[PDB]
DNA sequence: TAGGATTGCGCAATAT
DNA sequence: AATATTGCGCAATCCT
């Protein structure tokens, strides 16, 4: 049938579009993980640096 | 054909398994985002807390 | 009721 | 030989 073919073709085009977006969304999510992981490492270093800074300062005052 | 029957039966199982595996991997990656986002917020608050404590202590210098 | 978007699945060629 | 992967596509259901 001609009508049939037309209707199927439209959905097949829609399907490829939907799959492309989902796969792209996936790639984006993966990039987000790399970004968040980098930020996590930065924050961890910051927390450790400040914690040591604070600990040393507290020790000094305690000596008073 | 019986050989065709088992062929399709086994491949449909493998296809579904392969696709579920890919879906799980994607769902997992999505969980990492929610997980890293929450943790980063927690560490950021910790950074702010630590900075406030340092500031408080140093004021005692005056 | 119409039509695109989303989802799960089947098939068959092909990769492992 | 058998399982894993994937382009093409069907059909049901979701959503606007």
Tab-separated table of C-alpha atoms (C1' of nucleotides) in Angstrom:
chain	number	residue	atom	x	y	z
A	1	UNK	CA	0.000	0.000	0.000
A	2	UNK	CA	1.093	3.566	-0.757
A	3	UNK	CA	-0.561	5.082	2.312
A	4	UNK	CA	1.102	2.434	4.473
A	5	UNK	CA	4.582	3.130	3.108
A	6	UNK	CA	4.138	6.867	3.711
A	7	UNK	CA	3.029	6.387	7.309
A	8	UNK	CA	5.838	3.938	8.085
A	9	UNK	CA	8.493	6.180	6.530
A	10	UNK	CA	7.373	9.078	8.718
A	11	UNK	CA	7.741	7.031	11.892
A	12	UNK	CA	11.079	5.561	10.819
A	13	UNK	CA	12.381	9.101	10.364
A	14	UNK	CA	10.972	10.034	13.779
A	15	UNK	CA	12.603	6.964	15.339
A	16	UNK	CA	16.054	7.790	13.991
A	17	UNK	CA	15.620	11.339	15.302
A	18	UNK	CA	14.584	10.135	18.768
A	19	UNK	CA	17.454	7.652	18.955
A	20	UNK	CA	19.953	10.330	17.869
A	21	UNK	CA	18.803	12.671	20.646
A	22	UNK	CA	18.938	9.946	23.302
A	23	UNK	CA	22.428	8.928	22.182
A	24	UNK	CA	23.527	12.566	22.170
A	25	UNK	CA	22.014	13.112	25.607
A	26	UNK	CA	24.099	10.144	26.698
A	27	UNK	CA	27.317	11.669	25.348
A	28	UNK	CA	26.466	14.930	27.089
A	29	UNK	CA	25.856	13.101	30.368
A	30	UNK	CA	29.247	11.412	30.002
A	31	UNK	CA	30.938	14.801	29.490
A	32	UNK	CA	29.122	16.073	32.567
A	33	UNK	CA	30.614	13.232	34.623
A	34	UNK	CA	34.136	14.170	33.521
A	35	UNK	CA	33.379	17.803	34.390
A	36	UNK	CA	31.869	17.013	37.792
A	37	UNK	CA	34.702	14.617	38.558
A	38	UNK	CA	37.281	17.291	37.796
A	39	UNK	CA	35.408	19.737	40.039
A	40	UNK	CA	35.225	17.074	42.750
A	41	UNK	CA	39.001	16.625	42.730
A	42	UNK	CA	39.439	20.397	42.947
A	43	UNK	CA	37.031	20.653	45.880
A	44	UNK	CA	38.686	17.749	47.699
A	45	UNK	CA	42.097	19.385	47.421
A	46	UNK	CA	40.573	22.633	48.685
A	47	UNK	CA	38.917	20.927	51.683
A	48	UNK	CA	42.163	19.191	52.611
A	49	UNK	CA	44.191	22.382	52.229
A	50	UNK	CA	41.809	24.426	54.413
A	51	UNK	CA	41.428	21.643	56.988
A	52	UNK	CA	45.212	21.518	57.493
A	53	UNK	CA	45.373	25.315	57.604
A	54	UNK	CA	42.677	25.394	60.268
A	55	UNK	CA	44.204	22.540	62.270
A	56	UNK	CA	47.586	24.259	62.409
A	57	UNK	CA	46.006	27.553	63.449
A	58	UNK	CA	43.938	25.901	66.181
A	59	UNK	CA	47.073	24.216	67.523
A	60	UNK	CA	48.801	27.588	67.793
A	61	UNK	CA	45.987	29.216	69.750
A	62	UNK	CA	45.711	26.157	71.985
A	63	UNK	CA	49.362	26.666	72.934
A	64	UNK	CA	48.410	30.027	74.464
B	1	UNK	CA	13.070	-24.959	10.002
B	2	UNK	CA	13.815	-26.033	13.572
B	3	UNK	CA	17.373	-24.745	13.303
B	4	UNK	CA	15.915	-21.372	12.351
B	5	UNK	CA	13.548	-21.530	15.326
B	6	UNK	CA	16.292	-21.977	17.918
B	7	UNK	CA	18.395	-19.453	16.006
B	8	UNK	CA	15.819	-16.692	16.388
B	9	UNK	CA	14.968	-17.736	19.946
B	10	UNK	CA	18.613	-17.504	21.046
B	11	UNK	CA	19.357	-14.270	19.179
B	12	UNK	CA	16.272	-12.504	20.584
B	13	UNK	CA	17.551	-13.376	24.055
B	14	UNK	CA	21.030	-12.044	23.213
B	15	UNK	CA	19.659	-8.879	21.605
B	16	UNK	CA	17.475	-8.079	24.595
B	17	UNK	CA	20.400	-8.798	26.941
B	18	UNK	CA	22.718	-6.526	24.954
B	19	UNK	CA	20.208	-3.701	24.895
B	20	UNK	CA	19.425	-3.970	28.624
B	21	UNK	CA	23.154	-3.853	29.342
B	22	UNK	CA	23.475	-0.645	27.311
B	23	UNK	CA	20.452	0.863	29.071
B	24	UNK	CA	21.918	0.038	32.479
B	25	UNK	CA	25.231	1.657	31.563
B	26	UNK	CA	23.385	4.824	30.531
B	27	UNK	CA	21.268	4.831	33.679
B	28	UNK	CA	24.447	4.380	35.704
B	29	UNK	CA	26.185	7.334	34.056
B	30	UNK	CA	23.096	9.377	34.909
B	31	UNK	CA	23.389	8.327	38.548
B	32	UNK	CA	27.012	9.450	38.616
B	33	UNK	CA	25.847	12.951	37.715
B	34	UNK	CA	23.316	13.046	40.547
B	35	UNK	CA	25.903	11.511	42.870
B	36	UNK	CA	28.766	13.847	41.948
B	37	UNK	CA	26.452	16.857	41.992
B	38	UNK	CA	25.289	16.113	45.541
B	39	UNK	CA	28.798	15.393	46.783
B	40	UNK	CA	30.258	18.541	45.192
B	41	UNK	CA	27.575	20.615	46.924
B	42	UNK	CA	28.502	18.936	50.207
B	43	UNK	CA	32.213	19.664	49.768
B	44	UNK	CA	31.463	23.252	48.730
B	45	UNK	CA	29.517	23.770	51.959
B	46	UNK	CA	32.437	22.233	53.832
B	47	UNK	CA	34.807	24.711	52.170
B	48	UNK	CA	32.564	27.568	53.275
B	49	UNK	CA	32.319	26.153	56.786
B	50	UNK	CA	36.100	25.841	57.050
B	51	UNK	CA	36.580	29.392	55.763
B	52	UNK	CA	34.147	30.715	58.368
B	53	UNK	CA	36.041	28.918	61.136
B	54	UNK	CA	39.387	30.301	59.983
B	55	UNK	CA	37.927	33.809	59.876
B	56	UNK	CA	36.487	33.466	63.384
B	57	UNK	CA	39.831	32.310	64.804
B	58	UNK	CA	41.845	35.032	63.090
B	59	UNK	CA	39.533	37.690	64.511
B	60	UNK	CA	40.808	36.618	67.934
B	61	UNK	CA	44.109	38.141	66.845
B	62	UNK	CA	42.703	41.644	67.218
C	1	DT	C1'	-9.012	12.210	15.615
C	2	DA	C1'	-4.252	13.762	13.988
C	3	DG	C1'	0.773	13.351	14.082
C	4	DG	C1'	5.438	13.445	15.956
C	5	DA	C1'	8.148	11.388	19.979
C	6	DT	C1'	9.463	7.432	22.680
C	7	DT	C1'	10.148	2.741	23.670
C	8	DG	C1'	10.725	-2.295	23.230
C	9	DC	C1'	11.486	-5.661	20.256
C	10	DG	C1'	12.584	-8.696	15.834
C	11	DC	C1'	15.486	-9.604	12.094
C	12	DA	C1'	19.694	-10.537	9.720
C	13	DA	C1'	24.307	-9.249	8.697
C	14	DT	C1'	28.354	-9.024	11.091
C	15	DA	C1'	31.711	-8.747	14.867
C	16	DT	C1'	33.830	-11.490	18.599
D	1	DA	C1'	29.318	-23.118	17.081
D	2	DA	C1'	27.432	-19.669	19.931
D	3	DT	C1'	26.971	-15.207	21.962
D	4	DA	C1'	27.373	-9.960	21.328
D	5	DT	C1'	26.517	-6.008	18.538
D	6	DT	C1'	24.006	-3.014	15.424
D	7	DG	C1'	21.514	-0.786	11.051
D	8	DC	C1'	16.908	-1.031	9.467
D	9	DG	C1'	12.391	-1.164	10.556
D	10	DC	C1'	7.431	-2.616	12.830
D	11	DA	C1'	4.113	-1.535	16.058
D	12	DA	C1'	2.267	0.009	20.518
D	13	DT	C1'	2.018	3.640	23.400
D	14	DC	C1'	3.118	8.322	25.001
D	15	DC	C1'	2.710	13.161	24.476
D	16	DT	C1'	1.402	17.606	22.478
